Design an enzyme around this catalytic site. Sequence first.
Site, PDB file in Angstrom:
ATOM      1  CB  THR A 149     -16.506  48.379 -60.187  1.00 15.45           C
ATOM      2  OG1 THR A 149     -16.437  47.474 -59.302  1.00 15.45           O
ATOM      3  CG2 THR A 149     -15.673  49.591 -60.157  1.00 15.45           C
ATOM      4  CG  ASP A 177     -20.377  50.985 -58.962  1.00 15.15           C
ATOM      5  OD1 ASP A 177     -19.208  50.669 -59.257  1.00 15.15           O
ATOM      6  OD2 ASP A 177     -21.153  49.944 -58.828  1.00 15.15           O
ATOM      7  NE  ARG A 182     -25.243  45.784 -58.481  1.00 13.52           N
ATOM      8  CZ  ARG A 182     -26.262  45.832 -59.373  1.00 13.52           C
ATOM      9  NH1 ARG A 182     -25.883  45.100 -60.347  1.00 13.52           N
ATOM     10  NH2 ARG A 182     -27.357  46.226 -59.056  1.00 13.52           N
ATOM     11  CE  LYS A 189     -17.902  49.112 -56.392  1.00 20.78           C
ATOM     12  NZ  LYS A 189     -18.454  48.601 -57.553  1.00 20.78           N
ATOM     13  N   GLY A 220     -11.507  45.388 -60.127  1.00 25.02           N
ATOM     14  CA  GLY A 220     -10.791  44.272 -60.237  1.00 25.02           C
ATOM     15  C   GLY A 220     -10.977  43.191 -59.069  1.00 25.02           C
ATOM     16  CB  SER A 223     -17.976  45.449 -65.610  1.00 28.25           C
ATOM     17  OG  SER A 223     -18.470  46.210 -64.245  1.00 28.25           O
ATOM     18  CG  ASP A 241     -21.647  47.184 -65.712  1.00 26.28           C
ATOM     19  OD1 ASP A 241     -21.511  45.903 -66.453  1.00 26.28           O
ATOM     20  OD2 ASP A 241     -20.863  47.507 -64.994  1.00 26.28           O
ATOM     21  CB  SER A 299     -21.866  49.143 -62.401  1.00 24.38           C
ATOM     22  OG  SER A 299     -20.628  49.004 -62.484  1.00 24.38           O
TER      23      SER A 299
END
EC number: 3.4.25.1
Lengths: 222, 198, 198, 212, 233, 125, 196, 196, 222, 204
Positions: free
Chosen positions: A1, A17, A19, A33, A47, A129, A166, A169
């Site tokens: 994320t 993002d 994902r 999100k 998290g 992340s 990342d 993500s």
Amino acid sequence: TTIVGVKFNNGVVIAADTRSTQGPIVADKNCAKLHRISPKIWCAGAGTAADTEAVTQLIGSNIELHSLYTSREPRVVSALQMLKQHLFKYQGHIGAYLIVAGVDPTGSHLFSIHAHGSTDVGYYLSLGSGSLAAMAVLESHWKQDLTKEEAIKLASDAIQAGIWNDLGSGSNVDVCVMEIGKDAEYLRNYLTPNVREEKQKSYKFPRGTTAVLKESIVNICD
Amino acid sequence: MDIILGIRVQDSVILASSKAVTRGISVLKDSDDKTRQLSPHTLMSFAGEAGDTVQFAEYIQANIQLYSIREDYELSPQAVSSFVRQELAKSIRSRRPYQVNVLIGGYDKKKNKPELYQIDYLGTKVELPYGAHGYSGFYTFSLLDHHYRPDMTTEEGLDLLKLCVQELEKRMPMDFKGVIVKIVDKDGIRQVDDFQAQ
Amino acid sequence: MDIILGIRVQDSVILASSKAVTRGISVLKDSDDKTRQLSPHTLMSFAGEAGDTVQFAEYIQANIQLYSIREDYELSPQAVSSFVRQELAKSIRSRRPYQVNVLIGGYDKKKNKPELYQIDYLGTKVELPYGAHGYSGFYTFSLLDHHYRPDMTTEEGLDLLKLCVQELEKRMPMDFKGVIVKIVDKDGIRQVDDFQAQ
Amino acid sequence: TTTLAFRFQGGIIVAVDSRATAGNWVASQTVKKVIEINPFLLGTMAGGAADCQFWETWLGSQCRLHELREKERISVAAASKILSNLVYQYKGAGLSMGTMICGYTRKEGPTIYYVDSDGTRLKGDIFCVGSGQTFAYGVLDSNYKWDLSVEDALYLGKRSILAAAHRDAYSGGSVNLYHVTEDGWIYHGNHDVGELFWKVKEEEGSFNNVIG
Amino acid sequence: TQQPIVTGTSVISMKYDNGVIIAADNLGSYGSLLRFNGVERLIPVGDNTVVGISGDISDMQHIERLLKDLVTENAYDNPLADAEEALEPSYIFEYLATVMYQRRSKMNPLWNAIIVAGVQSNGDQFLRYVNLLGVTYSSPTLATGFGAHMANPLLRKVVDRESDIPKTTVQVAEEAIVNAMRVLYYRDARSSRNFSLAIIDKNTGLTFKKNLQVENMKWDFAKDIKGYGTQKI
Amino acid sequence: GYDRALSIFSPDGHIFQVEYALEAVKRGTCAVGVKGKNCVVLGCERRSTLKLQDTRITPSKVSKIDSHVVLSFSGLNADSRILIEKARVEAQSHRLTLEDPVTVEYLTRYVAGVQQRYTQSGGVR
Amino acid sequence: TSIMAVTFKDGVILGADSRTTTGAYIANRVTDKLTRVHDKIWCCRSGSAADTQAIADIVQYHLELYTSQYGTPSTETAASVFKELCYENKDNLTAGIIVAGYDDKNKGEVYTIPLGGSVHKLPYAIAGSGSTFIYGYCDKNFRENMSKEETVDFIKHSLSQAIKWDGSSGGVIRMVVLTAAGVERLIFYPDEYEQL
Amino acid sequence: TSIMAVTFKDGVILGADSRTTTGAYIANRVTDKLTRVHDKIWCCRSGSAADTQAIADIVQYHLELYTSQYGTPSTETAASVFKELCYENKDNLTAGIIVAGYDDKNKGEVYTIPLGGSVHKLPYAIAGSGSTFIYGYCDKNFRENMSKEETVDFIKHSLSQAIKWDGSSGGVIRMVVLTAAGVERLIFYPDEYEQL
Amino acid sequence: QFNPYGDNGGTILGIAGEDFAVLAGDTRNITDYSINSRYEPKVFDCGDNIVMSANGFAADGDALVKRFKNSVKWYHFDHNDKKLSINSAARNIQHLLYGKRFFPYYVHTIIAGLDEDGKGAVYSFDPVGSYEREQCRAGGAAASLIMPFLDNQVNFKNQYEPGTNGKVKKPLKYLSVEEVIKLVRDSFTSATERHIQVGDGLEILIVTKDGVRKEFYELKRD
Amino acid sequence: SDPSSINGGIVVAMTGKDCVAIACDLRLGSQSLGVSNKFEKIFHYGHVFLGITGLATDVTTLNEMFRYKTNLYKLKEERAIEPETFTQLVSSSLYERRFGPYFVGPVVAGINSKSGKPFIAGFDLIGCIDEAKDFIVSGTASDQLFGMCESLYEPNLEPEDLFETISQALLNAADRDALSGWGAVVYIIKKDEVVKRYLKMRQD
């Protein structure tokens, strides 16, 4: 994320993002999100997904009830105080990491909260992340007194840094602008730079391909 | 573990349960009846942790008997089994869970059909033609998967068990000291006192 | 563990050893002979760790036979036992010790007396009227402590074992699938093929 | 894995499943768990794929050397002991294998040897080895007779593995059959459980539980 | 098996149209103590290769000695040591990678992350990485430790794929690397303001810059930030 | 440590040490063996350079390698022991691994191999 | 983290770095570790950010209710509240707090509540990971009754050293001056203190 | 333990405290941590006494044989030997050594070999448990090319502070002066340095 | 404590045709949530018309490939430049792998080529040398997402003749190199969608009696 | 050990043109021992369908629970609950056991009776909602199901076609998982009717 928050000359913007992942597998290729605490207080979380979502609604619920009781607009500091004291109480077991932003009668605000209950304040923030890929971008382009457009770009660029660099993500970029005098505008899938190419073949099966043993109608009506 | 087997034939449910009670190095008893009659047409066999085993059985027995007297009626096997599953399902998430596995065999006087329910200590329930708890299932499920027929008579059922019990006496490491067999049908519950050589 | 028993009567040594070979959940064999003849008048029974058990037995067998051919003579039971103890005593302090317990029964042609030696995997040796390895000793030592007499005939000895084996089949948790009995006396080693009901 | 081998009048039957797993993951449904050591020696495989395949293939090389050296076919007992003694040298290191060495020599006749990585070596008439052994035992034990027909014995064997493939989550795929007579082993096909199950169900009337 | 004591942080690098650039700060950390400040972590080998090392400094010094020897040894009975038979960057790397994997394979690793940057004799740019596990890989850009998380995203915006290399100039490239070093100074708690940078160009040769410093840092906005939520003064 | 090549070829293609080893056998007491249709018999002579021995204990010329195989010899006595011992050990080792006593040809092939090896190994005659 | 409080002629000054880390990563480089629990009673936080923030917030609440009923609280009283929370909940807290306030009767005062929850009144106090490195320096350069300018200098130098050696410290140096005159916020950037 | 080496105009000086503890007990209060591996090449030992002693003894041996064959060894060479032993045997050693020697061509030199076995040449170096407390102080007061008297003062003050804060350090302060003039042993008692 | 192993992600795929065979694999190499390289070849041409890939712990996979190639080289030196048949290479690989039975090459390896009858062949191995010849095999990170697909689309599993009441199985007609390449590409675009360690690029090596050919296709870089 | 790997089983749902499909296997075992091949994992309350994989006892408990809750809901609301609403009821019910969760992987499928729109959703054991438009997967062979769905799936399939696609996804994924299979049932759902079919599959 990858979630970010960027303050600009007359407001604040948050992006993220889309994902969602279980281990290395992508469960949701386009989840949202960006959560709403109140009409003009929006939150982004990383998290334990269920935790960011539950904590966001709980505080959001009480913020609404508080607003009705006090006949006043919800204040970001209130969402901040309520969120943190709740997370603190649970000593980090509610794995919620959030970037909460919004505008209210006292101005525009940008904060971050950690699972254990500590809070931060700043002009640009990133969590998840993708945190580092994004912060690298923000640390390279942020400047004081950004315009609504510059902020959207900077934020959008940060989330991209995450999507591309990342593994935790990817997919799309959701944005939400909160300007001091207007309604907050939520931009679901503001960017969609990861559309799946057309498949090489169609796997539509010839009817009758599957061997059936028994068939029957199901009663739905009472 | 102990041997707990059950097989539902045409008009009845047969329950075979090992007679041994072993603690450590010694076989303390060889005539143990690992069963409790919940109602005139419902029988329950059980195996598991030393004390929890009987305490649980008798507890369920008491509750069913109380229901029977309050309503002057006998709960169907399906109802009694659902009650037992919920009890175990509550237990699994309590301070000290009942570590007990059970087989509930009962004859449903209203449907006029025998029923066999297998329920483990987690509250996992499933209705079966034949069931077993513990290591027995490892040698009796394929046996029955082979020699079992829905229309079997009570007599063919007893022959079937005998076949199971023999396989268990050949390959199982433990000496479970034979089994006690009981039959549940439209006329209640009776014990086959002659299985030591049938 | 397995059943390894031994009893020294008037003119012979009798060795009873369980026939089962169980691995985990299955009884792989029920006619296992847990014994090796070291010399015409010396027999050794053994029980313990899966592979070490036979490997050790055969290793000792090989060495005794080599001694026999080199010297054209048969080492006394006492000598063979001392050799086995030292072998195990070396083993206990090596990289991977032989986890094997043994009973050595032999007839000493020079002294014209039967002898029974009990030696555990640590190299602990002791000569006894009767011995056992593992859990058996727990129910057979007091039995024999009661019904044993030095002047017993080979026949009284077999009755004595039968008594041991019955106690073991009543109270032991495991089904060791009966025993194989062998007699060691002035005329060598012979097996009692009829103990399944003597 | 499920593997069996049993001695009867017409020689020896050897049946195995063909599933391979790594946890709950079915890595293969088409693995060979029977190595033809030579025209008259078969070896069954259960445990670690690598350990079995490697050491049993090596066993074969050892048997071939025995024959070049002694100008005589290795005995089932000696061949099994080679593996057993090798495996014992590695005791404690972690090798994982439950094997069956089946053969026919003029000197020993039909012979079966169980050999596992614990170092256990046993001679017997009936053996079932593998995570699904108990299931096979249940079917095989209750229908075994020294006087079965080469036709019936083959079937029981086949049916026994089927039983195991059905109840054991770690066994499955297909059944590989073998018949051992002094003129060597005779391959008797690869029966996919996927079709064998239904056929047996219908024709036999068993597996009465499952709905078809 | 061991554990690192004195350590060096990130080593960032990328390749442009005519060569490759590689940099690393001059810090030698000891846990959280910023103990040493005159630590050069860029090892030049000859005039076509530069080796950047991060991780355990004592192991780095050892790797350094290995490299000096490789040079000495290659010169033995080699009349073309400064020409056709000089040490190539790829030779230097394959050597080090061989060593790294042998050591992890003996369960006694050289606790480092290494990036070998240089230009081959045929002009090709060489950039490859190897660490304590013996793992190796190449990419238009490469960074170790923290630089992998923060430098790569920035540097990859200049050269996202291969085709972007010829389009990238020494200036654009050196600028990206210098900005990255600043970012790392902002967020890596084991980083130093002082660092070294080296360019290996197939025309200008090897340029080794020492004592650089992160400049043009934004810190002013800090004054406007008070409290951690509700505090106003 | 000592590995001098004692058994080596000479110009005419002979290994003199092996040849001289045969001379040692020529000097040893006679030994014979004839096989019947259902048996084999081994005869050996007894020296007389000194007579006052104790035949009970004096090592005999025919030795049992295993219970079904015997070995007689002519030559150096001390040397025969070494071969007999190795033969006996191999006999047991073979029973231990093949689970069957050795064949006479096998036991023979083995003794021969030990002898052959001593003709082309350093430091030994 | 590197924080300190120094009493001087006209009152007291609190200083701190602005770096908060989670591992080797700098989660925030502009943190404000100087927290206000009352008009002229502030504190320096070290240890668990979540814990020290919660602590401070509770204290601020207590001093606010206290003021409502009994007027302005002494710095000694503020330090007592911190202590009560830190001592009584020592098993679940990781907080090291420096309390510094300005009273008119007591001028400037500094109290330090280390990990255990004990309280210590001192002329000045240093704490935080980076403090270990400036024990020698501070002991050698501290003088009682320094002037505002001298004190700001002492804190500026001491912390610049702490920041120099401790990687858990860094960023800007924040200060808060507490005197009868009022409250003054001071900040110093790297480019200045790094070259001292 | 608190030990340090400082290069100055005329050569170099090594200083150390004299306290060795096993737990909270002072096993020796007059320890001599200044070890001679060669006439004008000394070292300061920290970490395992058993390890550092063995290390030094081996080094002394190596420099003695070296001298027999190639004359007096450079301080750089002595530091190389320590390194070879410390690096190559890092898994079984707990040694932190400061090497300091006086050469005629190189004047004074200081090398520090920390736990890993790495080597660092420096103007001066501090180490030992007590050193953490004087990083700030030493960085602020060290000047290159000080006079013997100034250097003895610097070391005396720095260590007095280290000893003041670190309980693992204490006793007397020992020094060794290495110059072309020769070797000089210096000592300073508590009563003097405690009041600085 | 030191852990000698690592996971570099990636997925490889091998399908065998009637007179050809393919070995494909993404070109992404990662560590945790970072991408080490978007292009780092993982499928190799080892000579004698044999392609192989050892997926998993890269350092291990590389050492294995390296060792096998050197094996082929010496095979020539010792057997008058004889060609190493694929069945022989497979057995050879088994020994290479099993030689490290007590400190395994943490890799799932596949090789492809043609047997001695010119037919396409695929062999896959256990980390410790277990092996079998097959028609197709997916290996690596997405193996669990792709194998089910290949069971269905290459071996027509669970597929029947419409209207035959699941009594007649779908015939085993065999795939062409063109049909196979479609399955491969679709397998990887599907994998890339649901697995965070797969993407960036797809490289396929095709083996025919004429040698080894390579095709490359981009894949989503998120 | 792992509650979600004791019994085994899978469930998958897909949307089609004015239709939805939810399918599951029939296995219920205890580790390697297969026990029942009649353990269905799909239930329905009104026109809303719920599939549950994971620990069998929790699968049963949750079903009895949602029947209980949906019954009261109907009595008070005087209308049958909708897919969207139920999904929220499932989520809150799971999160209510946040620190002592039911070890399940629920899946909801249905057609909103008022808007006719097709609906499916998945949840983790503590209630986190996954709202995908294409397909939801759950169980011990979820990786396989993800692979099968992502490859085989395509928008607006017709009921008769969505049936082939879903069945092929379930079946082939189940066959690469030792804990799944042993039978299977598929549900084709349309505004007015619902068909239930038992598939023929490997029994190993």
